[PDB]
Symmetry: D3
Subunit: 186 residues, 6 copies
C-alpha cells in the first residue's frame, strides 16, 4: 500500500528530529501522519518546513484553529489535493464540532451557511489560490471590515500561501493520507 510516488525513508535514514516527531505523534494520536514519513526524503528541509508549518497552523497566533482549518479546507478543495483535504477536513470537523459544516466547506463554502467573517476568509482564500495575479490592496478591505487586523491578515495570507505550497508538494508526490483521518471527528 504505497503512500508516496518516491521511496519513503526508514528510521535509519532520517534525522533525530523526524524520529522524535514520529514517536510523539504515535503516543499522542495513535498513528504517524504519512506526510512525516513521505516528506522526510530531504531531512533537514523537512524539519525546517515542519518548524514553520507547526508554528503557523498548530501553535498560538492570531487566527483560531477553526479559522485556520477553514482556510486549509477551502484551498485544498480548490486545488483538489487529497492528502491535505482529508487531513485538514478531520481537523476542521474537530475544531468546528460540526462534521456536516466541515464537509460542506470541502465542497463549496458558498453553500455551507458560514458567518460573514467565515465567508470573507473563504472568499479571499479561494481568490488568492485561483487568481494570485489579480489580488490587490482593495481585497484587504473586506477582511478589515469583518474585523481582521494587520497581524491577522499577515497570518491569513501565510496560511493560504502555505496550503498552496503543501497542496503542490502532496499532489506532485502522490502523498496518501492515513485511514484514521477519514474516520476522525465523525
Amino acid at each position: 500500500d504505497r503512500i508516496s510516488s518516491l521511496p519513503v525513508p526508514d528510521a535509519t535514514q532520517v534525522p533525530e528530529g523526524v524520529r522524535k516527531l514520529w514517536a510523539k505523534a504515535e503516543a499522542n494520536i495513535g498513528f504517524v501522519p504519512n506526510v512525516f514519513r513521505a516528506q522526510a526524503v530531504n531531512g533537514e528541509q523537512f524539519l525546517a518546513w515542519w518548524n514553520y508549518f507547526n508554528l503557523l497552523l498548530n501553535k498560538e497566533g492570531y487566527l483560531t484553529n477553526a479559522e485556520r482549518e477553514l482556510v486549509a479546507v477551502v484551498v485544498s478543495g480548490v486545488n483538489r489535493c487529497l492528502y491535505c483535504a482529508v487531513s485538514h477536513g478531520a481537523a476542521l470537523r474537530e475544531f468546528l464540532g460540526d462534521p456536516q459544516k466541515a464537509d460542506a466547506v470541502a465542497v463549496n463554502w458558498r453553500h455551507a451557511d458560514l458567518t460573514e467573517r467565515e465567508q470573507a476568509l473563504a472568499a479571499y482564500a479561494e481568490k488568492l489560490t485561483r487568481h494570485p495575479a489579480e489580488v490587490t490592496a482593495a481585497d484587504l478591505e473586506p477582511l478589515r471590515a469583518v474585523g481582521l487586523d494587520d497581524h491577522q491578515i499577515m497570518e491569513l495570507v501565510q496560511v493560504i500561501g502555505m496550503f498552496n505550497l503543501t497542496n503542490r508538494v502532496s499532489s506532485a508526490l502522490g502523498f496518501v493520507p492515513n485511514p484514521e483521518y477519514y474516520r476522525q471527528a465523525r
Copy 2:
C-alpha cells in the same frame, strides 16, 4: 515611499533575530531586502519562514542555485508577482551570468533556448503552478529522464511550492522590490 500594503515594523517592533538579519543583509549585499521589513509584521512566523526559505533556496541542497532560480523565475512569471519576479530575476542573472537568458525565462521559458534539463524543470514548474489538480506520477518521468534523483525531485517540488507561497504573500500584501534588484547583474 510605500513598500507594503500593511504597516511596516521598525527596529523596535521586530524581534532581535530580525534585526540581526537586517544587519547581515546590509553587510553582505549592501542593503536590507524590503521583504525582511514588510513581512516581519508577525515576527516569529517571519523567522520560521526565513529559516526554511534560506535553507531551501540559498544553502547547499540537491539542485544548483541556477536551477532553483530558474524555477523561481518561471513560477513568479506565471503568477505575475512583482517582488519575486524582480528579486529572483536578479538572482538568476547572477547565477547564469547571462542577463538576456534570465530576461527571456521571465517572459516564456519555451522561447529562451534552454537545455533539455532546464526545459524539463521549467515545464514542470509551470504545470505544478497552474494545474496542481492534474499532476500525476507520470509527470515525474521526464524529470528522471534529465537525471533528477529522488532528493532532487523532493527539493524541486518544495521550490515550486515555496514560490506559490511567496508569490501569494507578496502579491496579497503589495510588497515592493528594492530598486537595486532591477540593476543587479546587468
Copy 3:
C-alpha cells in the same frame, strides 16, 4: 431551516404523484430527500425529471450502480455542487462498501487508486464536464479499451450529462442535502 432559495411547496401544493414519491422514500430510506420537496416547485416537470433520473441512475441499466455513482461523485466534485456531492457521496460509499475510497474520489480520482476501468470512467467524466467543446470520437477509444460497449457508452454520456443538469439546478437554487447523507455508509 432553509432547504432552497425558492419557496418549497407543501403536500397541498404538489401533485399526488409527488406525495406518493415522498411516502415511498420515507418507507424505503427513512426520510424524504430534500430535492423531492425543493424541486417540486413545477410539479409535472419534476415528475418527468424523476422518471428519467430514476431510470438512468437507480434502475437496472448497462453500468453498475457503483460505476454510475463514481461518475456522479467526479462530476459533482468538479462542479462543486453541495447537494449532489453529499447525497451521491453517500450512495458511492454504500455501493463500494469503502468510505475512504469514495471520499478520495470526491477530492481527486487521480489520487484514489482506482482500477483501470474506473480511471477511464472518471477521466472521461471530468473531461466531458469541463471541456464539452473538445471531446471527440477519439475519446471513446479508452472506454472501449476497458470493455465498455455501445450501450454502456450511451448510458455513461447520459449520466455525465445528467449530473451537469442536476449540479446546475441544485446549485442555482441552493438545494441543501439532508443531514442523513453525511452519516450514511460511514
Copy 4:
C-alpha cells in the same frame, strides 16, 4: 454519411414509442430528427429523456418558446455543440421571426440587441453554463427584477441544465444535425 459515433439502431431495434415518434416527425415536419435515431441506442432511456425534454421545451409551461430557445442557443453556443446549435438555431429563428437576431445570439448575445429581460436570461444561462460553482442566491435577484416568478426560475434553471445535458450527449457521440435545420426559417 454518418450521423453518430455509435451504431444507429434500425426500426427493428427500437421500441414502439421511438418508431411512433419517427412517424410523427416525418408526417408533421417532413423529416426525422437525427437525435431520435442516434440517441435511441438505449430505447427506454431515450423515451424517458424525450418525455422530460418534450415537456420542458415543447409543451406549455412558464416560459415562452422564444425564451426557451434563446437559452438553448446561448448554452449551445457557449458549449459549441453542433447538433444543438443548429437545431435550436432553427427553432429560435422560427419563434423570433427574425433570423438575423437568432444568428447574432448564436455568436454573442451581448451584441444581439436584446431586451432587458432577454439579456438577463442570456447572461444567467451563460454564467450557470460556464461557472456552476460560482452561482449563488444573489444571481436570482436580476431574474426577479425582469419579472420572473418562482415557476419561471424553476423552469429556466432546468432548461439551462438540460442543454448542459444535451450538449454533452450530442458532442460526446458526434451527433449530426439534419440538413433541413440549416435552411429552416431563413
Copy 5:
C-alpha cells in the same frame, strides 16, 4: 440604427481614399460594409489597415480564399465576435459553395467533417487564438504534414493574427454587420 459604439464619420469626415473605397464596395457588392464607416474614425490608420487586410485576405497569396475564410470563421467563433463571424461566414459559404459546412465550422470545426488539411488549419487557428503562450515549433509539424510550405505557414499565422486584431477592434467598438451578410450564399 446604430452600427458602432463610437460616432460614425460621414463622407465629409473621412479622407478621399475612404470615399473611393465606399464607391468601389457599392459597385462590387451592392452595399458599403459597415466596418468601412465605423472603423474610419481615424482615417489614415483605417486606410493602412485596409491595405494590409485586403492584401492578406482578398488578394492572391499562398492560401486559398476558402482556406483563409475557414481560419477567419474558426477564430471569430472562438472569440465570439459578431461582425467578423457574420461577414466571414458569408465569405466562407461563398467560397465553399456549402452553407451547411460553413455553418458547422462556425460552431465547432471538430464536428464539421473537414478534410485532414482543413482540420490541421482549424486546430492550429484555435490553439494560436486561445493559447498563444503555449505554441511552439512542434505545432508547425502537422501543418507541414498536410503540405503547407514556409510561405503558406507565414500567411496562416498572419491570418490568425489578423482575426485576433479585427475580432478585438470590432467587439471593443460594437461594430454591427450589414443585414446582407446573414442572407448571402444561402
Copy 6:
C-alpha cells in the same frame, strides 16, 4: 544562432522596401531588428504589415509613444511573447525614462504604481486581450473618464489588437529579439 522557426530570407530574396528598411535601421539604431528579416518571408505582406504597424506605433497619432508602449508591454506580458516583450520593453524604458517602472509593468501593471489614466489603459488592454467575448460598450466608459476621446479610443483598440496580432505571429514562428534590446535604455 536561430532567429526564427522558418528560413530567413537573404538580401536577394526580399523586395527593395525591405532592404531599404534594413539599411535605415542599421544607420539609425546600429542594428537590424530581427523581425524585419524573419517576418520578410512573404515580402509584400510584410511591407503592408510594416506600413500599418509603423503608422500606428511610431508615427504621430492620438496616443503618445509612452501610452502606446505601455499597452504593448501589458499585452505582450499577458500573452508571454518574447520578441514583443523584450523589444517593446526597451521602447517603454526609453519613453518613460524609468527602467524600473517599465520592468514592473512587464510583470504586473497592478503593482507598478501607475497613474489613473495609465491604470485605465493597462486594465482595458488586459481585458480585451484575455476576454474579447466579454467586452462591451460599458468598458469604454472608464476610458472616457480618464479623458480619452473617440480618436484616442479608436487608436487604443487598434494598438491592443495589433499586439494580439504580433504576439501571435512572433510566438508561432519563434522570433528571437536582438541582444541590443535587452540592454537598451537601462
